[PDB]
């Protein structure tokens, strides 16, 4: 039970009533801004909003800014929903919050560019710290993830990030072998000891294919399974591609566990 | 971990390698036997077999026999898979095992017709005892289910049913209000204390509709959720309509829990 709300500027996400669904949002001849790109992005944001999403996830440094900023301007204007920027770069994160993004989403947990934590602290936005490393050489998988995530928190907190603006992510499908991904899934509740909300990103990932022997477009039931087990282990967010399907699955879980 | 195998005549089901999927099998102008009925039933058994099922569930006393026997004769002849007979009637169960059914499936847990337990004992077949009662007046839901199931076991055991041929079923969607169905789902692990394999039948049931507000044909993600939570609480079998989808979901769960 959370004694606070996730504060994202205009919108506020309660962490107790339901599992929050973060939808993953989708051009040559262009460096960024086109009518085809930004319109296709808006149609997708609109659709995801209609089918249950609570957050929209939008994700060459000069290029990244000129691609992603126009998309954030449009979607935040036209879809009444908090937006997260999927970057590990300090400068891109700044840009995106300027252009209207509400939440930062760092796949390197402030280790790639520590200054990103300083960006987060400054704009007073929620930051997702995902587990990652440049190797798969674990002494004890869970004990090391928790160790590594903790170092991400230290960087965030030293930078002035408030406890309430910190969300953790086990980084499934990162620096982990098929068997190590399943181990983290099996032991996800361990992350709860750190005292922070947890986000789970497993949608359509490679290890589902390893188990089911099924290609990326055939991983819906597999995704569902990982979402269900994640919610049962106390996840606050799930980052999925199939918003309609996962929303229903999340909703039925919530009823059963009594969230 | 089970130190024995579920013995069903010609076929043997191991209870440790995977969650066993039981598929639910599907005429006017006829009292039983027609070419349309039994062929449509065989096509369905064949399909379910092809998409992951491990058991086929086939389910006016004179009528019941003349309807169900011809279907069992055909399916057991043409599909290499154990068959269960979904009845609570002693005479129908006898007939069906004579006609080739391998497992009895009693929705009244030997309380409607105690002589059915005697049928089961005699042919030495596995029997599923499902929780049921003629009222919803519970002191303590779980404590009462376990009490009631135990009385089913007493009838079975007095009749000569061996411990290894007994499987339990919480009887979700029976004698339980929408809120009581969710409570049993939340507390399913409690059934494990009785020492018997558990089968979970929640496919497309009314309470999924109550939660999701969705009609019977729109309850696939909801079913999945109940299956995933059930496997996580240690179910050995799931009784589902959507064999393709649930098999994949069962398989991905099994990988994650380490079954
Ligand atoms: N927080 C978080 N951010 C991500 N960004 N990008 C990716 C990669 C894109 C995709 O494969 O889903 C990802 O998996 C995650 C994640 O699991 N979690
Ligand atoms: N063991 C068992 N047998 C059944 N027979 N028939 C039914 C009813 C048919 C259907 O609605 O699925 C059932 O739900 C069960 C069950 O949940 N479990």
CB contact under 8 A, B255 and A211: yes
SS3 state of residue B57: strand
Angle between helix axes B35-50 and B61-78 (nearest 10 degrees) is: 50
How is B108-157 classified by DSSP, letter by letter?
TTTSS-THHHHHHHHHT--EEEE---S----SSHHHHHHHHHHHHHHHHH
Nearest ligand for residue B167 CA: 2
Asked if the A1-259 domain carries CATH number 3.40.50.9100, the reply is no
Instruction: Give me the DSSP letters along chain A.
Output: --SS-EEETTEEE-SSSSPEEEEE---TT-SS--HHHHHHHHHHHHHHHHTT-SEEEE--HHHHHHHHHHHHHHHHHHS-S-EEEE---HHHHHHHHHTT--EEEETTTTSS-THHHHHHHHHT--EEEE---S----SSHHHHHHHHHHHHHHHHHHTT--GGGEEEE--TTSS--HHHHHHHHHTGGGGGGG-S-BEE--TT-HHHHHHH---GGG-HHHHHHHHHHHHHTT-SEEEES-HHHHHHHHHHHHHHHT-
> Which of the ligands is closest to the CA of residue B107?
2
Say whether B239 is catalytic.
yes
Q: Report whether B135 contacts B180 (CB < 8 A).
A: no
Tokens of A12: 């506020």
Ligand 2 centroid – CA A24 distance (Å): 38
Given the residues A186, A239, A251, A259, the one annotated as active site: A239
Domain ranges across chain A: 1-259
Which experiment gave this structure?
A: X-ray
Q: The tokens of A134 are what?
A: 């440049």
3-state secondary structure (DSSP) of residue B19: coil
CA dist B250 and A129 (Å) reads 31
Which residues have CB under 8 Å from B2's CB, separation 6+?
B15, B16, B197, B236
Q: How far is CA A206 from CA A103, A108, A172, B63, in A?
A: 26, 19, 10, 52
Is the Cβ–Cβ distance between B19 and B231 less than 8 Å?
A: yes
A239 a catalytic residue: yes
What is the rounded distance in angstroms from the CA atom of residue B33 to the CA atom of residue B67? 6
Its sign, for the CA torsion B26, B27, B31, B33, is negative
Q: What resolution in angstroms, rounded to 1 decimal?
A: 2.5
**Which of chain A's residues have a Cβ under 8 Å away from the Cβ of B245?**
221
Q: Which two tokens stand for residue B152?
A: 């089913």
Distance CA B58, CA B74 (A): 12
Contacts of A249 in chain B (CB under 8 A): 221-222, 224-225
Per DSSP, A141 falls in state H
Ligand 1, atom nearest to A130 Cα: 1
> How far is B125 from B6, CA to CA, in rounded Å?
9
Query: Which residue is it, tokens 């919108």?
Result: A11
The CA B201 to ligand 2 mean position distance, Å, reads 6
- Tell me the two tokens of residue A35: 């009518």
């Amino acid at each position: 039970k959370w004694d606070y709300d996730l504060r994202c500027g205009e919108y506020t996400l309660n962490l107790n009533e339901k599992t929050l669904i973060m939808g993953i949002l989708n051009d040559s001849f262009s460096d960024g801004g086109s009518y085809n790109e930004v319109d296709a992005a808006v149609r997708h944001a609109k659709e995801m909003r209609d089918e249950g999403a609570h957050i929209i996830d939008i994700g060459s440094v000069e290029e990244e800014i000129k691609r992603v900023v126009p998309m954030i301007q449009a979607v935040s204007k036209e879809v009444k929903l908090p937006i997260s920027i999927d970057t590990y770069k300090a400068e891109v994160a700044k840009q995106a919050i300027e252009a209207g993004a509400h939440i930062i989403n760092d796949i390197w947990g402030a280790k790639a560019e520590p200054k990103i934590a300083e960006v987060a602290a400054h704009y007073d936005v929620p930051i997702i710290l995902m587990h990652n490393r440049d190797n798969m050489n674990y002494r004890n998988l869970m004990a090391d993830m928790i160790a590594d995530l903790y170092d991400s928190i230290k960087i965030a907190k030293d930078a002035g990030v408030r406890d309430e603006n910190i969300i953790l992510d086990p980084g499934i499908g990162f620096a982990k072998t098929p068997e190590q991904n399943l181990e983290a899934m099996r032991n996800l509740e361990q992350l709860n000891v750190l005292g922070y909300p947890v986000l789970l990103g497993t949608s359509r990932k490679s290890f589902i294919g390893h188990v089911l022997d099924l290609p990326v477009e055939e991983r819906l039931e597999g995704t569902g399974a990982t979402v269900c087990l994640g919610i049962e282990k106390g996840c606050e967010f799930v980052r999925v591609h199939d918003v309609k399907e996962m929303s229903r699955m999340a909703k039925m879980m919530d009823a059963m566990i009594g969230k």
